[PDB]
Amino acid sequence: MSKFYKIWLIFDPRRVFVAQGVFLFLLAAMIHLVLLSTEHFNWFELAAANA
Amino acid sequence: MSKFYKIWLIFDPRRVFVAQGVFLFLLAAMIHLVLLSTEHFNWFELAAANA
Amino acid sequence: MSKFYKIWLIFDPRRVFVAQGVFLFLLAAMIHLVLLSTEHFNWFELAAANA
Amino acid sequence: MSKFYKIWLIFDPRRVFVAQGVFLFLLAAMIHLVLLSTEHFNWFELAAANA
Amino acid sequence: MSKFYKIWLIFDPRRVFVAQGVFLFLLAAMIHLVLLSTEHFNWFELAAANA
Amino acid sequence: ALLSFERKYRVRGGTLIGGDLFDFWVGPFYVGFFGVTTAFFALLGTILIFWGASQQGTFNPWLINIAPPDLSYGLGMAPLMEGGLWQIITICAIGAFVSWALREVEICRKLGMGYHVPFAFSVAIFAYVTLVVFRPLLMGAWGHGFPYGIWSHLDWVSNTGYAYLHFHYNPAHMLAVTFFFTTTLALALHGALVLSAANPPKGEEVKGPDNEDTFFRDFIGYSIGTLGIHRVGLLLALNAGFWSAVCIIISGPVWTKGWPEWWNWWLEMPIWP
Amino acid sequence: DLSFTGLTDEQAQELHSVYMSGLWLFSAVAVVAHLATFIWRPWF
Amino acid sequence: DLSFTGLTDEQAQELHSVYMSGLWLFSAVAVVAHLATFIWRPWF
Amino acid sequence: DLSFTGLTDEQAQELHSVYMSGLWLFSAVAVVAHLATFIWRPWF
Amino acid sequence: DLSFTGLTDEQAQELHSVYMSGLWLFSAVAVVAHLATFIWRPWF
Amino acid sequence: EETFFGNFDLASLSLWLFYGFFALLIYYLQTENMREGYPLEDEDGNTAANQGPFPLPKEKTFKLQHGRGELTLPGEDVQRRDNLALRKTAHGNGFPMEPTGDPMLDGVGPASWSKRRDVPELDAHGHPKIVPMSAAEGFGVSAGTDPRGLPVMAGDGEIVGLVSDMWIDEAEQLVRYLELELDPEWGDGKRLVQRQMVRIKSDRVKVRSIYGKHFKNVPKTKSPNQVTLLEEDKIMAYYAGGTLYADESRLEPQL
Amino acid sequence: PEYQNIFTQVQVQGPAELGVDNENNLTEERTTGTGFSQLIGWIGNAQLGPIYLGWFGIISLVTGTLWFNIVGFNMLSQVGYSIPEFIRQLFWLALEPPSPEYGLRMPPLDDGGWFIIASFFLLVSVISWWLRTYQLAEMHKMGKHVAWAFAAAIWLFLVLGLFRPILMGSWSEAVPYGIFPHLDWTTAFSIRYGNLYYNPFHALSIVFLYGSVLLFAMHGATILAVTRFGGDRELEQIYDRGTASERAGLFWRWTMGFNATMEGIHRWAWWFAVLTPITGGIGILLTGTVVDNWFLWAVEHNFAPDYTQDYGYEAYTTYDGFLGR
Amino acid sequence: KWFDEWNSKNPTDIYKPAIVVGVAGGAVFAAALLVSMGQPLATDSMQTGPR
Amino acid sequence: GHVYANAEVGVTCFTCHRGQAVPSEVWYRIDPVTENTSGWASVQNRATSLS
Ligand code: BCL
Ligand SMILES: CC[C@H]1c2cc3[nH]c4c(c3C)C(=O)[C@H](C(=O)OC)c4c3nc(cc4[nH]c(cc(n2)[C@@H]1C)c(C(C)=O)c4C)[C@@H](C)[C@@H]3CCC(=O)OC/C=C(/C)CCC[C@H](C)CCC[C@H](C)CCCC(C)C
Ligand SMILES: CC[C@H]1c2cc3[nH]c4c(c3C)C(=O)[C@H](C(=O)OC)c4c3nc(cc4[nH]c(cc(n2)[C@@H]1C)c(C(C)=O)c4C)[C@@H](C)[C@@H]3CCC(=O)OC/C=C(\C)CCC[C@H](C)CCC[C@H](C)CCCC(C)C
Ligand SMILES: CC[C@H]1c2cc3[nH]c4c(c3C)C(=O)[C@H](C(=O)OC)c4c3nc(cc4[nH]c(cc(n2)[C@@H]1C)c(C(C)=O)c4C)[C@@H](C)[C@@H]3CCC(=O)OC/C=C(\C)CCC[C@H](C)CCC[C@H](C)CCCC(C)C
Ligand SMILES: CCCCCCCC/C=C\CCCCCCCC(=O)O[C@H](COC(=O)CCCCCCCCCCCCCCCCC)COP(=O)(O)OC[C@@H](O)CO
Ligand code: HEM
Ligand SMILES: COC(C)(C)C(=O)C/C=C(\C)CC/C=C(\C)CC/C=C(\C)CCCC/C(C)=C/CCC(C)CC/C=C(\C)CCC=C(C)C
Ligand SMILES: COC(C)(C)C(=O)C/C=C(\C)CC/C=C(\C)CC/C=C(\C)CCCC/C(C)=C/CCC(C)CC/C=C(\C)CCC=C(C)C
Ligand SMILES: COC(C)(C)C(=O)C/C=C(\C)CC/C=C(\C)CC/C=C(\C)CCCC/C(C)=C/CCC(C)CC/C=C(\C)CCC=C(C)C
Ligand SMILES: COC(C)(C)C(=O)C/C=C(\C)CC/C=C(\C)CC/C=C(\C)CCCC/C(C)=C/CCC(C)CC/C=C(\C)CCC=C(C)C
Ligand SMILES: COC(C)(C)C(=O)C/C=C(\C)CC/C=C(\C)CC/C=C(\C)CCCC/C(C)=C/CC[C@H](C)CC/C=C(/C)CCC=C(C)C
Ligand SMILES: COC(C)(C)C(=O)C/C=C(\C)CC/C=C(\C)CC/C=C(\C)CCCC/C(C)=C\CCC(C)CC/C=C(\C)CCC=C(C)C
Ligand SMILES: [Fe+3]
């Protein structure tokens, strides 16, 4: 647990950072869209309905 | 954190700037169009209605 | 803030100005045509409906 | 800057002039047709109405 | 059972780690969708019904 | 295991993205960044297909059917059992196909070759995206796509053609069928000519390009040549796939009546008495 | 096609000057046309 | 100190001023246009 | 010590300073725009 | 020591420190966002 | 029509017979395509433990023309390179190799050539197939733009010399090579470029694969009137290797 | 971008090639006279001619022109010798096969007699063109692959026109000679015998046709990408392996786990193309003679899908709601 | 005015960034036009059997 | 059973007549459609007003 830095002795950070950024953005976009695909958690419809 | 500047020793300032610029413009355009696609948040028709 | 003059120390100004011009025209065209699509901001249909 | 002639040393007059001419003609024709598509500004229908 | 470390004399960590990284995320995504495709365990529909 | 001449070509570099983080081989297969995305998407799609098969009630390969939603759902998302699994599998398939093409691009870059093969595969991707994304969006509902079933995606083809009465009379379908038949006749001729040049009767010497050019000018009075035949085969195949996409995208969003009636413009031309 | 391989300094001042002479001519004509059109059928 | 184009500190500093002036003039023209349009037909 | 770009340490510290200065202005403008939009038409 | 990358032990330690420091800030921001969303509209 | 048993009729019998025939045909087709490159080897040059599910085919003989002899396949690899300047980047199998010196001069990677026969290819009459145009009776440019006399520009924007001649295949009536005379500043002598690597314009001829400084190390033919297959392979591979090795930015990820 | 090799940059022209010869003396029957086309030369060869004239080719040409003129003149006479109407309705006219009541006997000339006379002249023409294709290989001292590939398609030709009508007992089972009328025959044949989708040999024929078109896209593209290494000279690559064959093989080996050789890919192409008409003819020969309803056959053999939902537009919508009323 | 630079640091494909901009942000233009004004020739269909 | 299939929709004179004496869309026999033909050859291979 205190020797997890050695992961940078196996994988090059330059090529890991780009892949992590792409993965994170795609996952966030997918989750936001999945929320927008429902009725209870669609915040654009809720404002129209409430007002 | 105080050592975040070291991100510029792994990455090259020229492709970061090109990438950021494209991503930000595309995201802004997508959000503006998504707002235009709704009923409550279309600012062109609200002026017509309140007129 | 006062040190933004190094963007051209990183970017090719001659290669950027043409892209800026093309981008700027496309933006302006898009906006006028979008404005021409609405009932409250079509300036040709206004004069017909204003005597 | 006071004299902007220093912009033609990074350009080739031939293609710039050709593109300019094509762009000018296309924009003028599109404006004329857009005016012709409007009820209030169609000058051919107005002569028939003033008859 | 105490000689399991010898597995690293057979397989290089670089290939095994990427294979495991693909496998684990694939499994997680599938179980969430198998869960999301039922009536009893869909937590998006439960919040709408319990409301 | 390598072929006798393969070791000198296995060098490092030539990747679009990933560097040497994914620059290796598994068996004969090359993996890169697009080899990891292909594996993920394809495995997820197959596992979801078999989960849907388990919920349908049959594991028979002939009878498995996963179908798009009803037209009443429009362009929204349906419940996962009433057509949503089809949408997820469609997304996974698009991702897998694009990753396959971008992996071929990296292999071409590493070997120092031209990029003709990925460009040719892009045409088949375009015919599939027209069938499941472009026509359905234009027509206004995802339920216009074909289902994922070995014998149920032929029922879709049959019903979609009789919805325009006599589909043989579609002008762009006639062009596409001609291209298909011509590609097969030309492939047969090319294979036969090369094999007959390389395999003479027992006791004879092998032949060269001069002999091949001569046989074809004697047979029909013309010979395209050893370089022209490949250009012509590629062009014929790509024209076949492009015209197929056109024949389907006009049948729905552009024309509503029967296809024979479209020919009326020829029958009532003012020149005719 | 580039045989000129770059313009010079003094081969550009004259160009700018002649180009500017046409741009101002075209714009004066457009201004008069727009003024006449506004007098005929206003839009504001 | 460092460069990927070829310019220097003071020289790029001087090159930035022309861009700044052009951008400010363009922005002023656009601002006057938007201000006139708002009084003509408001969007808020 | 560690370097993959060839850029040194002090250069990186200057570049990051200017970059963060340029990012905070964008953030502030976006925050003001978002607040004005919420006052005009709330979404929560 | 084993190294397939070219980095030393000290360099890897120094890199990991900053990487984890960034990850914790990302996680904290996500936690606050999730708490606000749960208060606004609770799942479970 | 009746059935033999159960639901089995003539169509079922035909279908199963075709199944069996197609299995045998697949076996034959896969076995026929294993006459080159086998048996398999590992990354150290030793025979591999695994050889796959299909056994190797029996031998065929080809009788060649012009007294070149006979060819029997499958057989020994006669096109094998001897001393390759390459280095393993791992202890096992499945990882890439690194060049030891100059990859373009050592003929490795995308610059690799195969050891072909050291004789020119012949036509039907037993004559060399590819001949310079200055010695080809009756040939002339009938369409397109003639590149003779135009300057040649490299991939980095340098003029390296002039086109002096063209080498044509007379049997098929096609241009195969362009001959370039170098300026003294960029080397000496004459070099060849294959036709598929050039773009002929109105005022220039462009070669994008290599730079100017690479033009002196293009392999040279022995005779000024004919070129053998080995020289052809070494010249074409040299230009092909520049697409990856000309600049360090061409080898790194483009992102 | 780099040159792509779809169009030739510069063309060169020399003396016309008259062809190779041996002890069989092919020169005696070859025509003299050649031409050159620079429009075609942008893609392939520019030389036109010469051609070989034997007896098989002459007989084939004469008997095929006779068939064409019996059909064309019958079509012209059906319309009253009106040339403008002949042009107007060209795609719609045909020479119709005999009526079912006549069996395999000779029908009246007005009701299929000219169809049978013209069918005998087309038969003779096709079999003569095949004997020419075999003789020329024999005279050129090459293999007989071209003749075998042609006979593969002749098999389906003969099944459609000769064998199946005889086994069924009527000349009325043949295909009419027309553009649209022959497509109506295809649709009516599919409808009359259930659904031709559920004929397994029809599915196999579709499999092999799809496979043959996928293989010319792959082979054409692969050969055009290795033309910078001399890859279009395939025969010399077979006789002496070069780097073009190695790179072409390694591309597909690294892509899909197995590859071919320079000589062996042409066997793959030859077999996929040849297998389409063989399976098609076997499928056509089994229709009506053995199986009369292919959908009921599929239901019997359990590969027909089943659907749960209902049929009808009012199970999904309303007539007023579809009109916007 | 110290421009011995343009000629010395000569090679610059000044056009490629603009073409890329005009291609990328040109798809945003047709997307904006299909969202503002709708589909030109729309059509609706009636379902008569299973999905 | 046909005219009242789904609702009360009868027929009057204004169903085949629509203000005319001869109702639209009536048909006659036109069978030998070609000349010099005798059986199934006499009825089909022509574009007519009944096909
Ligand atoms: C309603 C329509 C029916 C249908 C009805 C039929 C019928 C009926 C048949 C086909 C047949 C075929 N169908 Mg089907 N078919 C349907 C739907 C499809 C679909 C689809 C929906 O996508 C596809 C891809 C196909 C495809 C095919 C082919 C795979 C196959 C033809 C084989 C062949 O070699 O053709 C190429 C054609 C030939 C080889 C003909 C031979 C030509 C001869 C040799 C020419 C001689 C020379 C000539 C006379 C000289 C001319 C003049 C010269 C210029 C000198 N069908 C539907 C279900 N199909 C055929 C088959 O084999 O069925 C199993 C067939 O008979
Ligand atoms: C499936 C492949 C098809 C095919 C293709 C084919 N045949 C061809 C060609 C092509 C592409 C020619 O270019 C060539 C020709 O010149 O036709 C007029 C020819 C030919 N195929 C022929 C025979 C033939 N082909 C047959 C088959 C086929 N060939 C198929 C239909 C058959 C039959 C029944 O199976 C026959 C009998 C002759 C009509 C002709 C033989 C060539 C010949 O005799 O040339 C003599 C030379 C000349 C002087 C005539 C050339 C005309 C001009 C005066 C020359 C100048 C060229 C000009 C600039 C352009 C005009 C040429 C055009 C063809 C573009
Ligand atoms: C001119 C266009 C022609 C063409 C071209 C073409 N296709 C190509 C290529 C080229 C040039 C390749 O290089 C490439 C290749 O590698 O071939 C070996 C390929 C290829 N085209 C293929 C097949 C194929 N091509 C076809 C047709 C054609 N492709 C055209 C005739 C057809 C049909 C229906 O006629 C098929 C089936 C593949 C064998 C291959 C590479 C595709 C591939 O492997 O993609 C990666 C994906 C997977 C391994 C699995 C994906 C799993 C999914 C996530 C789930 C499955 C969902 C699916 C939609 C279900 C469908 C059910 C059906 C019953 C309806
Ligand atoms: C393996 C199956 C595939 C295939 C293969 C195939 N076809 C073949 C062959 C092969 C291997 C030949 O060797 C043979 C050939 O000669 O090819 C060049 C052929 C052939 N396949 C043909 C047609 C054909 N093949 C088809 C199908 C297929 N053939 C499959 C796709 C199809 C269809 C329906 O898809 C057609 C239409 C011919 C081009 C040719 C057979 C030639 C023949 O037998 O001709 C008889 C000739 C006459 C009718 C006499 C001439 C009378 C003419 C009406 C007019 C005068 C001729 C003139 C040249 C034409 C008009 C042009 C004018 C400008 C002059
Ligand atoms: C049921 C099993 C498959 C799973 C079910 C779903 C997929 C079904 C679709 C297609 C199957 C294709 C699968 C091919 C994958 C090959 C993987 C691979 O790479 O396997 C190789 C071994 O393979 C080969 O050598 C090639 C095998 C043939 C290729 C497919 C032929 C398609 C022909 C016709 C079209 C098919 C349509 C049907 C017509 C029905 C007809 C009635 C290992 O490596 P190797 O080194 O080459 O070993 C060999 C040697 O060298 C020893 O040394
Ligand atoms: C073969 C004969 C005919 C066909 C194919 C046909 C077809 C149909 C069909 C399918 C419907 C039902 C429509 C629906 O359910 O939405 C219908 C209804 C009707 N048809 Fe016809 N029709 C035929 C001839 C005629 C003729 C000649 C007349 C009148 C004299 C006629 C009068 C009507 C009427 C009045 C209705 C409306 C009834 C209702 O739906 O409530 N039809 N026809
Ligand atoms: C309902 O049924 C269905 C079909 C739906 C199913 O869902 C069925 C599902 C299954 C059958 C599921 C089966 C699942 C498994 C078999 C799961 C197995 C899972 C594992 C073995 C997981 C292992 C995880 C291991 C991890 C995370 C290990 C290590 C992580 C590290 C960060 C370690 C770091 C290492 C370093 C730094 C090494 C550095 C050292 C040096 C010396 C350099
Ligand atoms: C590419 O790489 C580099 C490094 C070059 C970059 O990244 C560079 C990037 C740039 C140079 C980016 C430049 C970006 C801009 C110039 C952005 C400009 C943005 C604006 C000017 C935005 C203005 C937005 C205004 C809005 C949204 C106004 C809204 C008004 C109302 C909704 C009206 C209601 C208001 C009321 C009621 C008043 C109450 C509001 C209060 C705030 C009190
Ligand atoms: C609702 O659901 C959907 C999916 C629709 C969504 O909308 C989902 C949306 C998201 C998930 C969105 C996510 C968005 C982000 C993660 C956004 C992130 C944004 C940033 C990190 C932005 C940073 C911006 C920084 C800027 C503009 C900096 C500018 C700097 C400068 C202009 C200064 C330039 C510096 C120089 C010149 C250095 C000097 C040079 C030297 C050499 C010294
Ligand atoms: C509901 O069901 C469905 C399927 C729909 C789902 O939604 C399923 C979802 C999942 C299964 C989701 C799974 C998600 C994860 C596993 C997410 C994991 C996320 C992370 C591990 C994120 C890590 C982020 C780390 C970060 C941001 C670290 C650092 C950032 C920095 C900016 C640090 C910068 C570093 C520097 C400068 C080092 C340089 C130092 C030198 C010395 C040179
Ligand atoms: C409603 O929703 C939709 C999507 C429809 C929208 O409308 C959304 C719209 C947007 C999101 C729009 C966003 C727009 C922007 C972010 C725009 C930004 C614009 C700029 C920052 C423009 C700046 C322009 C500056 C200029 C032109 C200044 C000066 C230029 C020159 C002086 C030219 C000459 C320059 C020099 C130095 C001399 C030449 C030297 C050489 C070396 C060649
Ligand atoms: C009048 O104007 C002139 C003179 C210019 C003309 O001549 C004009 C001519 C035309 C406009 C002609 C037009 C011709 C067509 C449109 C023709 C179309 C032809 C077909 C589509 C034909 C298809 C034929 C056959 C098919 C599909 C399958 C199989 C057929 C056969 C195997 C035929 C062989 C028959 C046999 C073996 C039976 C013979 C009988 C015996 C008793 C031996
Ligand atoms: Fe080939």
| Residues across chain F | 273
Question: Helix or strand or coil: residue L168?
Answer: helix
Picking from K211, K251, K255, K252, the residue whose alpha carbon sits closest to that of residue K109 is K251
Query: Tokens standing for F254?
Result: 């552009």
- Pick A8's closest partner by Cβ from J1, J2, J12: J12
Question: Helix or strand or coil: residue K167?
Answer: strand
What is the rounded CA–CA span in Å between residue K79 and residue K114? 6
Q: How many CA atoms lie within 13 A of K243 on its CB side?
A: 21
Contact status of A18 with chain F (Cβ, < 8 Å):
yes
What is the rounded CA–CA span in Å between residue K225 and residue K168? 12
**CB of E34 shorter than 6 A to ligand 10:** no
- Say how far residue L313 (Cα) sits from the centre of its chain: 42
Cα torsion F212, F213, F214, F219: sign = positive
Picking from L64, C40, I2, the residue whose alpha carbon sits closest to that of residue B48 is C40
Query: Tokens standing for K134?
Result: 């200055």
CA angle F12, F17, F18 (to 5 degrees): 65
Query: Measured from the CA of D1, which atom of ligand 11 is nearest?
Result: 38
What is the rounded CA–CA span in Å between residue K108 and residue K238? 10
* Residue L34 bridge partners (DSSP): none
Picking from L195, M49, L291, L286, the residue whose alpha carbon sits closest to that of residue F154 is L195
Q: Which of the ligands is closest to the CA of residue F192?
A: 4
Interface of chain F toward chain E, CB-CB under 8 angstroms? 22, 24, 26, 31, 36, 39-40, 43-44, 47-48, 51, 55, 80-81, 84-85, 88
Angle between helices L113-140 and F209-220 (to 10 degrees): 160
Largest CA distance in chain D: 57
Which amino acid makes up residue D43?
W
C-alpha Rg value of chain B to the nearest Å: 19
What is the rounded CA–CA span in Å between residue C41 and residue C35? 6
Query: Tokens standing for F151?
Result: 């014998």
Cis peptide before K147 (omega within 30 of 0): no
| L135 touches L73 (CB < 8 A) | no
Picking from H30, L44, L229, A18, the residue whose alpha carbon sits closest to that of residue F213 is L44
Backbone phi and psi for residue D35, each to the nearest 5 degrees, phi listed first: -65, -40
Residues of F in contact with K111 (CB under 8 A): 112
Ligand 12 pocket test, pick from L90, L172, L177 with the greatest ligand atom count within 8 Å of Cβ, gives: L177
What is the rounded CA–CA span in Å between residue L220 and residue L234? 13
Query: Measured from the CA of E35, which atom of ligand 10 is nearest?
Result: 2
Helix (H) or strand (E) holding F184: helix F171-198
Contact status of K29 with chain F (Cβ, < 8 Å):
no
Interface of chain D toward chain M, CB-CB under 8 angstroms? 6, 9-10
Contacts of K57 (CB under 8 A, 6+ apart): K31, K32, K34, K35, K74
Cis peptide before K39 (omega within 30 of 0): yes
Task: State the nearest Cα–Cα gap between N21 and chain L, in angstroms.
Answer: 31
What is the rounded CA–CA span in Å between residue K63 and residue K61? 7
What is the rounded CA–CA span in Å between residue L177 and residue F181? 19
Which amino acid makes up residue A30?
M
Cα–Cα distances in angstroms (integers) from residue K219 to residues F166, K162, K235, L61, in the given order:
64, 18, 6, 55
Which amino acid makes up residue I28?
A
**CB of N11 shorter than 6 A to ligand 6:** yes
Q: Which residue has the tokens 């359905």?
A: F136
Write the DSSP string, F189-237. HHHHHHHHHHS-STT-----HHHHHHHHHHHHS----TTHHHHHHHHHH
> In this complex, which chains have at least 3 CB pairs below 8 Å with chain K?
E, F, G, L, M
Q: Are M46 and L311 within 8 A, CB to CB?
A: no
Q: Which residue has the tokens 């056109």?
A: F246
Instruction: Tell which residues of chain J come right before a gap with C–N over 2.5 A.
Output: none
State the virtual CA torsion across B22, B26, B27, B32 in degrees, nearest 10: 150
E43 has binding-site annotation: yes
* CB neighbourhood size of F212 (10 A): 21
Over the range J11-42, which residues count as b (16 or more CB within 10 Å of their CB) and which as e? bbebbbebbeeeeeeeeeeeeeeeeeeeeeee
Q: Which residue has the tokens 């079933």?
A: F149
**CB of H26 shorter than 6 A to ligand 11:** yes
Over the range L82-111, which residues count as b (16 or more CB within 10 Å of their CB) and which as e? eeebbebbeebbbbbbbbeebeeeebeeeb
| M16 touches L278 (CB < 8 A) | no
* Residue K5 bridge partners (DSSP): K8
Q: How many CA atoms lie within 13 A of K109 on its CB side?
A: 31
Name the residue at shortest CA distance from atom 11 of ligand 6.
N2
Query: Tokens standing for K135?
Result: 């010695």
Query: Measured from the CA of F224, which atom of ligand 2 is nearest?
Result: 11
What is the rounded CA–CA span in Å between residue L159 and residue L148? 17
What is the rounded CA–CA span in Å between residue N19 and residue L160? 54
Q: Which of the ligands is closest to the CA of residue M46?
A: 6
Task: State the nearest Cα–Cα gap between C44 and chain D, in angstroms.
Answer: 7
Instruction: Pick the residue of L111, L170, L171 with the most N CBs within 10 A to test the interface with N by mutation.
Output: L111
What is the rounded CA–CA span in Å between residue C17 and residue M18? 9
Helix/strand/coil (H/E/C) assignment for every residue in F239-261: HHHHHHHHHHHHHCCCCCCCCHH
Query: Tokens standing for H11?
Result: 């020289």
| E48 touches A39 (CB < 8 A) | yes
**CB of I19 shorter than 6 A to ligand 9:** yes
Largest CA distance in chain B: 57
* Terminal Cα-to-Cα distance of chain M (whole angstroms): 72
Cα–Cα distances in angstroms (integers) from residue A5 to residues B2, B5, J7, J11, in the given order:
20, 20, 11, 9
φ/ψ region of K81 (left if φ > 0, alpha if ψ in -120 to 50, else beta) reads beta
Task: State the nearest Cα–Cα gap between F221 and chain A, in angstroms.
Answer: 59
* Residue F2 bridge partners (DSSP): K41
What is the rounded CA–CA span in Å between residue F39 and residue N32? 66
- Say how far residue I20 (Cα) sits from the centre of its chain: 5
| F46 touches F88 (CB < 8 A) | no
F182, exposed or middle or buried, with CB in 10 Å at 0-12, 13-18, 19+?
middle
Report strand pairing: K159-169 vs K174-182.
antiparallel
What is the rounded CA–CA span in Å between residue C2 and residue L175? 86
Helix (H) or strand (E) holding H23: helix H9-40
Helix (H) or strand (E) holding D26: helix D13-36
Picking from L184, L177, L160, the residue whose alpha carbon sits closest to that of residue L288 is L160
| Residues across chain E | 51
Query: Measured from the CA of D4, which atom of ligand 11 is nearest?
Result: 38
What is the rounded CA–CA span in Å between residue C50 and residue G42? 11
DSSP 8-state symbol, K47 = B
DSSP 8-state symbol, L163 = I
Largest CA distance in chain E: 57
| L216 touches F237 (CB < 8 A) | yes
Cis peptide before N32 (omega within 30 of 0): no
Task: State the nearest Cα–Cα gap between I17 and chain H, in angstroms.
Answer: 16
Question: Helix or strand or coil: residue A21?
Answer: helix
What is the rounded CA–CA span in Å between residue I14 and residue A48? 48
* Terminal Cα-to-Cα distance of chain D (whole angstroms): 57
Query: Tokens standing for F48?
Result: 């979801």
What is the rounded CA–CA span in Å between residue C27 and residue C8? 24
What is the rounded CA–CA span in Å between residue N15 and residue K217? 92
Helix (H) or strand (E) holding K242: helix K229-245
Contacts of F233 (CB under 8 A, 6+ apart): F183, F186, F187, F190, L216, L217, L219, L220
Largest CA distance in chain J: 52
What is the rounded CA–CA span in Å between residue F120 and residue F108? 13
Query: Measured from the CA of L319, which atom of ligand 6 is nearest?
Result: 16
Task: State the nearest Cα–Cα gap between D17 and chain M, in angstroms.
Answer: 16
Q: How many CA atoms lie within 13 A of F230 on its CB side?
A: 23
* CB neighbourhood size of F118 (10 A): 19
CA angle D2, D8, D11 (to 5 degrees): 145
J26 has binding-site annotation: no
Q: Which of the ligands is closest to the CA of residue L126?
A: 4
What is the rounded CA–CA span in Å between residue A25 and residue F1? 39
H43, exposed or middle or buried, with CB in 10 Å at 0-12, 13-18, 19+?
middle
Cα torsion K119, K124, K128, K132: sign = negative
What is the rounded CA–CA span in Å between residue F234 and residue L217? 5
**Residues contacting ligand 5 via CB (< 6 Å):** K 19, 22, 30, 34, 51-54; L 207, 257-258
Cα–Cα distances in angstroms (integers) from residue N51 to residues E15, F161, L142, L192, in the given order:
69, 20, 54, 20
> In this complex, which chains have at least 3 CB pairs below 8 Å with chain L?
F, K, M, N
Q: Where are the alpha helices (DSSP H) in chain L?
A: 55-78, 83-88, 113-140, 145-158, 164-168, 181-192, 200-225, 234-239, 243-256, 264-285, 294-300, 319-323
Q: Which of the ligands is closest to the CA of residue H15?
A: 11
Picking from K97, K100, K118, K119, the residue whose alpha carbon sits closest to that of residue K43 is K97
What is the rounded CA–CA span in Å between residue K164 and residue E25? 62
Backbone phi and psi for residue L80, each to the nearest 5 degrees, phi listed first: 85, 25
Cα–ligand 12 centroid distance for L123 (angstroms):
10
Contacts of M37 (CB under 8 A, 6+ apart): C37
